[PDB]
Amino acid sequence: EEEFQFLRCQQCQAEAKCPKLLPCLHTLCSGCLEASGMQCPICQAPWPLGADTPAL
């Protein structure tokens, strides 16, 4: 309902490219997303560390 709201990518949405944790909508795509336009505070940091997400 909040934060978590995607599972593909910021711009290149094909098949979840960001395995980053999923509590802060960070399942976008490690390469073009960084709280720049998906719903996160300049996250760009804990990308490699994720909690309960799908990953790739």
Ligand SMILES: [Zn+2]
């Ligand atoms: Zn992308």
Ligand SMILES: [Zn+2]
């Ligand atoms: Zn985030």
